[PDB]
Design an enzyme around this catalytic site. Structure first.
Site, PDB file in Angstrom:
ATOM      1  N   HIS A  45       0.538  -1.370   0.424  1.00 13.14           N
ATOM      2  CA  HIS A  45      -0.126   0.308   0.086  1.00 13.14           C
ATOM      3  C   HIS A  45       0.776   0.907  -0.009  1.00 13.14           C
ATOM      4  O   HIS A  45       0.608   2.603  -0.020  1.00 13.14           O
ATOM      5  CB  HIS A  45      -0.797   0.422   0.962  1.00 13.14           C
ATOM      6  CG  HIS A  45      -1.036   0.329   2.339  1.00 13.14           C
ATOM      7  ND1 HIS A  45       0.178  -0.360   3.608  1.00 13.14           N
ATOM      8  CD2 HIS A  45       0.347   1.258   3.160  1.00 13.14           C
ATOM      9  CE1 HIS A  45       0.396   0.347   5.210  1.00 13.14           C
ATOM     10  NE2 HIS A  45       0.101   0.859   4.632  1.00 13.14           N
ATOM     11  N   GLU A  59      19.562   6.209   7.406  1.00 14.00           N
ATOM     12  CA  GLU A  59      19.059   7.565   7.745  1.00 14.00           C
ATOM     13  C   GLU A  59      19.190   7.603   9.111  1.00 14.00           C
ATOM     14  O   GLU A  59      18.458   6.225  10.054  1.00 14.00           O
ATOM     15  CB  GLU A  59      17.740   8.034   7.669  1.00 14.00           C
ATOM     16  CG  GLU A  59      17.227   8.944   7.431  1.00 14.00           C
ATOM     17  CD  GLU A  59      17.894  10.050   7.131  1.00 14.00           C
ATOM     18  OE1 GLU A  59      18.786  10.715   8.194  1.00 14.00           O
ATOM     19  OE2 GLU A  59      17.708  11.119   6.305  1.00 14.00           O
ATOM     20  N   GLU A  69      23.939   8.681   5.445  1.00  7.83           N
ATOM     21  CA  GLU A  69      22.656   8.345   4.324  1.00  7.83           C
ATOM     22  C   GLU A  69      23.834   8.330   3.038  1.00  7.83           C
ATOM     23  O   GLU A  69      24.456   8.099   2.531  1.00  7.83           O
ATOM     24  CB  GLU A  69      21.938   9.689   4.396  1.00  7.83           C
ATOM     25  CG  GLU A  69      21.645  10.205   5.817  1.00  7.83           C
ATOM     26  CD  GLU A  69      22.449  11.290   6.256  1.00  7.83           C
ATOM     27  OE1 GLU A  69      21.702  11.705   7.220  1.00  7.83           O
ATOM     28  OE2 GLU A  69      23.261  11.213   6.057  1.00  7.83           O
ATOM     29  N   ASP A  93      -0.027  -7.611   1.442  1.00  8.53           N
ATOM     30  CA  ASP A  93       0.769  -6.192   1.652  1.00  8.53           C
ATOM     31  C   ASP A  93       1.984  -6.318   1.770  1.00  8.53           C
ATOM     32  O   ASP A  93       2.432  -6.005   2.817  1.00  8.53           O
ATOM     33  CB  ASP A  93      -0.071  -4.692   2.981  1.00  8.53           C
ATOM     34  CG  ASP A  93      -0.264  -4.024   2.407  1.00  8.53           C
ATOM     35  OD1 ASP A  93       0.498  -3.258   1.695  1.00  8.53           O
ATOM     36  OD2 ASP A  93      -0.059  -3.243   3.734  1.00  8.53           O
ATOM     37  N   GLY A 186       3.163   5.976   8.587  1.00  7.79           N
ATOM     38  CA  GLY A 186       4.474   6.734   8.644  1.00  7.79           C
ATOM     39  C   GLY A 186       5.586   6.039   8.834  1.00  7.79           C
ATOM     40  O   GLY A 186       6.295   5.489   8.038  1.00  7.79           O
ATOM     41  N   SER A 188       4.068   2.521   8.119  1.00  9.13           N
ATOM     42  CA  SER A 188       4.485   1.251   6.967  1.00  9.13           C
ATOM     43  C   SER A 188       5.327   0.699   6.548  1.00  9.13           C
ATOM     44  O   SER A 188       5.612   1.529   6.192  1.00  9.13           O
ATOM     45  CB  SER A 188       2.930   1.918   6.192  1.00  9.13           C
ATOM     46  OG  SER A 188       1.714   1.934   6.895  1.00  9.13           O
ATOM     47  N   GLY A 189       4.794  -0.871   6.002  1.00  8.41           N
ATOM     48  CA  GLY A 189       5.772  -1.316   5.300  1.00  8.41           C
ATOM     49  C   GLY A 189       7.127  -1.647   5.893  1.00  8.41           C
ATOM     50  O   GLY A 189       8.342  -1.799   5.492  1.00  8.41           O
TER      51      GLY A 189
HETATM   52 CA   LIG Z   1      19.158  12.646   7.540  1.00  7.85          CA
END
Ligand SMILES: [Ca+2]
Length: 240
Positions: A45, A59, A69, A93, A186, A188-189
Site C-alpha cells: 500500500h 538514515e 545516508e 501487503d 508513516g 507502514s512498510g
Molecule cells: Ca539524516
C-alpha cells in the site's frame, strides 16, 4: 511509532526510509527493510500512488545530515500479484523495490535477516517495531528513528472478536495492543524485528492499525507475516 524511544543510531541498520518527491524536496512516506544491496521489502500500500520514490539507507534523523545516508532511486516496483488496495484486510501487503544502484554495506547499512518460511512466533514473543511514523494518533512524524517494544499477539487471540476478529488473517503478525505503544502512519512498510535463537529477524512488514487510532487497547498493530512470503520474495529476486 507511538510510545517509542529514540533508536540508537546503529541499532537497526536494515531500516530504510521510503520517500516521495514533493516539489523541490522529498517527503518520508513509509519504512522498508533492505534485503539485498539492491532490493528493499516494503508494504504494497506504500507504493499504490504513482509517485517518484527514493530509498534512504543509513538514515537516522530525517531532518539533518547524519553523515551516513545513501540515497538511491527506485527502478522497479513488484507488488504482490494478489494485493488489492481496496481490501488491506485480505493481506498480500508486500512489495519489493529494486534499487537503481546497489548500496554500500557498512555499520549503518546492513541486510535485514528474514525468518525461515512458515515460521510462526509463540504468543508474546519479544519484538520491536521501528520507524519514523507519527508519534501520536493524528500527530506528526518523528525526526529521529523510534523503536517500541511490541510483543506478538498470536493468531488465535488476534482474530478473536474483541481483537481484530475476521480482519486479521494467518498471513499476518499482530504485535502490541496495549493502548500505549503501536505503529502509526508513516511506519507502514517498515520492519517488526523479533528475537529468535539469539538473533533479530524481520518477521513483519508494517501494514495497518485501527481506524479508531494508532495505540488502541486490543487493536494491536498488524504486519504482513514475512515468513509467509519467502518463496515469493526469492522468486521475484531470482527473476529480476
Ligand atoms: Ca539524516
Amino acid at each position: 511509532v507511538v510510545g517509542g524511544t529514540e533508536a540508537q543510531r546503529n541499532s537497526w541498520p536494515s531500516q530504510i526510509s521510503l520517500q516521495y518527491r514533493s516539489g523541490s524536496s522529498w517527503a518520508h512516506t513509509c519504512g522498508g527493510t533492505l534485503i539485498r544491496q539492491n532490493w528493499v521489502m516494503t508494504a504494497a500500500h506504500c507504493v499504490d500512488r504513482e509517485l517518484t520514490f527514493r530509498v534512504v539507507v543509513g538514515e537516522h534523523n530525517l531532518n539533518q545530515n547524519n553523515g551516513t545516508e545513501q540515497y538511491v532511486g527506485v527502478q522497479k516496483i513488484v507488488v504482490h500479484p494478489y494485493w488489492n488496495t481496496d481490501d488491506v484486510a485480505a493481506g498480500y501487503d508486500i512489495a519489493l523495490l529494486r534499487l537503481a544502484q546497489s548500496v554500500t554495506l557498512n555499520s549503518y547499512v546492513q541486510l535485514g535477516v528474514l525468518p525461515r518460511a512458515g515460521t510462526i512466533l509463540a504468543n508474546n514473543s519479544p519484538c520491536y517495531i521501528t520507524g519514523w511514523g507519527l508519534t501520536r494518533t493524528n500527530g506528526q512524524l518523528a525526526q529521529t528513528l523510534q523503536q517500541a517494544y511490541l510483543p506478538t499477539v498470536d493468531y488465535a487471540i488476534c482474530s478473536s472478536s474483541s481483537y481484530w476478529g475476521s480482519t486479521v488473517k494467518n498471513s499476518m503478525v499482530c504485535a502490541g495492543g496495549d493502548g500505549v505503544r503501536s505503529g502509526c502512519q508513516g511506519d507502514s512498510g517498515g520492519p517488526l524485528h523479533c528475537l529468535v535463537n539469539g538473533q533479530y529477524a524481520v518477521h513483519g512488514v508494517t501494514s495497518f492499525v485501527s481506524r479508531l487510532g494508532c495505540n488502541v487497547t486490543r487493536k494491536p498493530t498488524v504486519f504482513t507475516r514475512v515468513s509467509a512470503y519467502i518463496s515469493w520474495i526469492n522468486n521475484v529476486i531470482a527473476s529480476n
